[PDB]
Write a protein that binds this ligand. Structure first.
Ligand code: HEM
Ligand SMILES: [O]
Length: 153
Protein backbone atom coordinates (compact mmCIF):
# COMPACT_ATOMS: atom_id res chain seq x y z
CA UNK A 1 0.00 0.00 0.00
CA UNK A 2 3.13 2.14 0.38
CA UNK A 3 5.01 3.36 -2.71
CA UNK A 4 8.57 2.26 -3.30
CA UNK A 5 9.43 5.88 -2.52
CA UNK A 6 7.67 5.83 0.87
CA UNK A 7 9.52 2.60 1.72
CA UNK A 8 12.86 4.27 1.03
CA UNK A 9 11.94 6.96 3.60
CA UNK A 10 10.97 4.25 6.19
CA UNK A 11 14.29 2.41 5.66
CA UNK A 12 16.34 5.65 5.61
CA UNK A 13 14.99 6.64 9.03
CA UNK A 14 15.28 3.02 10.25
CA UNK A 15 19.07 3.08 9.67
CA UNK A 16 19.21 6.00 12.17
CA UNK A 17 17.45 3.74 14.70
CA UNK A 18 19.99 1.01 13.91
CA UNK A 19 22.79 3.44 14.77
CA UNK A 20 21.46 3.30 18.40
CA UNK A 21 19.06 0.37 18.74
CA UNK A 22 19.17 0.20 22.53
CA UNK A 23 18.69 3.92 23.11
CA UNK A 24 15.74 4.01 20.74
CA UNK A 25 14.31 0.91 22.40
CA UNK A 26 14.44 2.48 25.86
CA UNK A 27 12.91 5.78 24.80
CA UNK A 28 10.05 4.03 22.95
CA UNK A 29 9.24 1.79 25.95
CA UNK A 30 9.44 4.65 28.47
CA UNK A 31 7.15 6.64 26.21
CA UNK A 32 4.84 3.62 25.94
CA UNK A 33 4.76 3.02 29.70
CA UNK A 34 4.55 6.68 30.68
CA UNK A 35 1.77 7.56 28.22
CA UNK A 36 -0.20 4.31 28.57
CA UNK A 37 0.43 3.00 32.09
CA UNK A 38 -2.01 0.14 31.55
CA UNK A 39 0.50 -1.31 29.06
CA UNK A 40 2.96 -1.69 31.94
CA UNK A 41 0.65 -4.26 33.49
CA UNK A 42 0.90 -6.37 30.30
CA UNK A 43 4.73 -6.15 30.46
CA UNK A 44 4.73 -8.31 33.58
CA UNK A 45 8.54 -8.52 33.63
CA UNK A 46 8.82 -4.71 33.70
CA UNK A 47 5.76 -3.69 35.71
CA UNK A 48 7.79 -3.02 38.86
CA UNK A 49 9.49 -0.15 36.99
CA UNK A 50 7.35 2.86 38.00
CA UNK A 51 9.74 5.80 37.35
CA UNK A 52 11.34 6.83 34.01
CA UNK A 53 14.64 6.59 35.93
CA UNK A 54 13.93 3.02 37.17
CA UNK A 55 13.03 2.27 33.50
CA UNK A 56 16.21 3.86 32.00
CA UNK A 57 18.24 2.07 34.68
CA UNK A 58 16.77 -1.34 33.65
CA UNK A 59 19.32 -3.07 31.39
CA UNK A 60 16.65 -5.81 31.06
CA UNK A 61 14.24 -3.26 29.52
CA UNK A 62 17.09 -1.99 27.31
CA UNK A 63 17.68 -5.55 26.04
CA UNK A 64 13.96 -6.05 25.37
CA UNK A 65 13.90 -2.80 23.35
CA UNK A 66 16.64 -4.21 21.09
CA UNK A 67 14.58 -7.42 20.69
CA UNK A 68 11.47 -5.37 19.74
CA UNK A 69 13.23 -2.98 17.36
CA UNK A 70 15.30 -5.77 15.80
CA UNK A 71 12.11 -7.72 15.09
CA UNK A 72 10.30 -4.60 13.89
CA UNK A 73 13.26 -3.62 11.73
CA UNK A 74 13.20 -7.01 9.99
CA UNK A 75 9.49 -6.46 9.26
CA UNK A 76 9.91 -2.95 7.86
CA UNK A 77 12.74 -4.03 5.56
CA UNK A 78 10.37 -6.63 3.92
CA UNK A 79 8.42 -3.62 2.50
CA UNK A 80 5.03 -5.28 3.20
CA UNK A 81 6.07 -8.88 2.38
CA UNK A 82 6.30 -9.74 6.12
CA UNK A 83 3.88 -12.71 6.42
CA UNK A 84 6.60 -14.97 7.86
CA UNK A 85 7.96 -12.32 10.27
CA UNK A 86 4.48 -11.42 11.60
CA UNK A 87 3.40 -15.03 12.15
CA UNK A 88 5.55 -15.76 15.26
CA UNK A 89 4.89 -12.28 16.61
CA UNK A 90 1.12 -12.58 16.30
CA UNK A 91 1.22 -16.09 17.78
CA UNK A 92 3.08 -14.96 20.88
CA UNK A 93 1.42 -11.60 21.36
CA UNK A 94 -2.11 -12.88 20.86
CA UNK A 95 -1.87 -16.28 22.64
CA UNK A 96 0.98 -15.94 25.13
CA UNK A 97 1.32 -12.29 26.10
CA UNK A 98 -2.33 -11.34 25.35
CA UNK A 99 -1.40 -7.88 24.03
CA UNK A 100 -4.47 -6.18 22.46
CA UNK A 101 -4.17 -4.61 19.01
CA UNK A 102 -4.73 -1.21 20.65
CA UNK A 103 -1.44 -1.57 22.49
CA UNK A 104 0.19 -1.84 19.07
CA UNK A 105 -1.28 1.57 18.21
CA UNK A 106 0.22 2.90 21.46
CA UNK A 107 3.74 1.58 20.70
CA UNK A 108 3.32 2.89 17.14
CA UNK A 109 2.62 6.38 18.52
CA UNK A 110 5.70 5.96 20.71
CA UNK A 111 7.96 4.89 17.83
CA UNK A 112 6.90 7.94 15.79
CA UNK A 113 7.32 10.25 18.78
CA UNK A 114 10.84 8.96 19.52
CA UNK A 115 11.86 9.08 15.85
CA UNK A 116 10.81 12.72 15.58
CA UNK A 117 12.39 13.48 18.97
CA UNK A 118 15.79 12.10 17.92
CA UNK A 119 15.75 12.95 14.19
CA UNK A 120 13.55 16.02 13.72
CA UNK A 121 15.42 16.92 10.54
CA UNK A 122 15.41 13.59 8.68
CA UNK A 123 11.94 12.66 10.07
CA UNK A 124 9.96 15.37 8.36
CA UNK A 125 6.41 15.41 7.07
CA UNK A 126 7.02 12.89 4.27
CA UNK A 127 9.08 10.48 6.40
CA UNK A 128 6.44 10.65 9.16
CA UNK A 129 3.70 9.97 6.65
CA UNK A 130 5.56 6.95 5.26
CA UNK A 131 6.46 5.53 8.71
CA UNK A 132 2.87 6.00 9.83
CA UNK A 133 1.67 4.13 6.73
CA UNK A 134 4.18 1.33 7.37
CA UNK A 135 3.24 0.94 11.04
CA UNK A 136 -0.44 1.10 10.04
CA UNK A 137 0.02 -1.81 7.57
CA UNK A 138 1.93 -3.71 10.25
CA UNK A 139 -1.00 -3.42 12.71
CA UNK A 140 -3.50 -4.21 9.96
CA UNK A 141 -1.67 -7.41 8.96
CA UNK A 142 -1.05 -8.49 12.53
CA UNK A 143 -4.71 -7.89 13.45
CA UNK A 144 -5.63 -10.25 10.59
CA UNK A 145 -3.26 -12.90 12.05
CA UNK A 146 -4.84 -12.41 15.53
CA UNK A 147 -8.28 -13.27 14.09
CA UNK A 148 -6.92 -16.30 12.23
CA UNK A 149 -5.55 -17.54 15.60
CA UNK A 150 -9.06 -16.87 17.02
CA UNK A 151 -8.12 -14.16 19.49
CA UNK A 152 -9.21 -10.69 18.10
CA UNK A 153 -7.08 -8.66 20.56
C1 HEM B 1 6.08 -3.13 17.24
C2 HEM B 1 5.44 -3.85 18.18
C3 HEM B 1 6.11 -5.05 18.89
C4 HEM B 1 7.10 -5.85 18.49
C5 HEM B 1 7.83 -5.86 17.12
C6 HEM B 1 7.37 -6.78 19.56
C7 HEM B 1 8.29 -7.79 19.54
C8 HEM B 1 8.53 -8.70 20.54
C9 HEM B 1 9.46 -9.81 20.47
C10 HEM B 1 10.35 -10.13 19.25
C11 HEM B 1 9.39 -10.47 21.64
C12 HEM B 1 10.17 -11.72 22.11
C13 HEM B 1 9.61 -12.97 21.43
C14 HEM B 1 8.12 -13.14 21.52
O1 HEM B 1 7.61 -13.54 22.59
O2 HEM B 1 7.39 -12.91 20.51
C15 HEM B 1 8.41 -9.81 22.46
C16 HEM B 1 8.06 -10.18 23.74
C17 HEM B 1 7.10 -9.59 24.50
N1 HEM B 1 6.32 -8.53 24.10
FE1 HEM B 1 6.29 -7.64 22.31
N2 HEM B 1 6.53 -6.51 20.63
C18 HEM B 1 5.75 -5.44 20.24
C19 HEM B 1 4.80 -4.84 21.03
C20 HEM B 1 4.49 -5.19 22.32
C21 HEM B 1 3.65 -4.39 23.19
C22 HEM B 1 3.02 -3.05 22.77
C23 HEM B 1 3.57 -5.00 24.37
C24 HEM B 1 2.74 -4.41 25.53
C25 HEM B 1 3.18 -4.49 26.79
C26 HEM B 1 4.34 -6.24 24.26
C27 HEM B 1 4.53 -7.23 25.22
C28 HEM B 1 5.47 -8.24 25.17
C29 HEM B 1 5.73 -9.18 26.24
C30 HEM B 1 4.99 -9.22 27.60
C31 HEM B 1 6.70 -10.00 25.83
C32 HEM B 1 7.33 -11.15 26.65
C33 HEM B 1 8.58 -10.59 27.32
C34 HEM B 1 9.02 -11.47 28.44
O3 HEM B 1 8.25 -11.67 29.41
O4 HEM B 1 10.18 -11.97 28.39
N3 HEM B 1 4.90 -6.30 23.01
N4 HEM B 1 7.90 -8.74 21.75
O1 LIG C 1 7.69 -6.78 23.04
Amino acid sequence: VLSEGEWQLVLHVWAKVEADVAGHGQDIHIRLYKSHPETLEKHDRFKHLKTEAEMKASEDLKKHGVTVLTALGAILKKKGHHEAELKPLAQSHATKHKIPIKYLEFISEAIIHVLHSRHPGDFGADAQGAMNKALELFRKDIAAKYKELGYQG
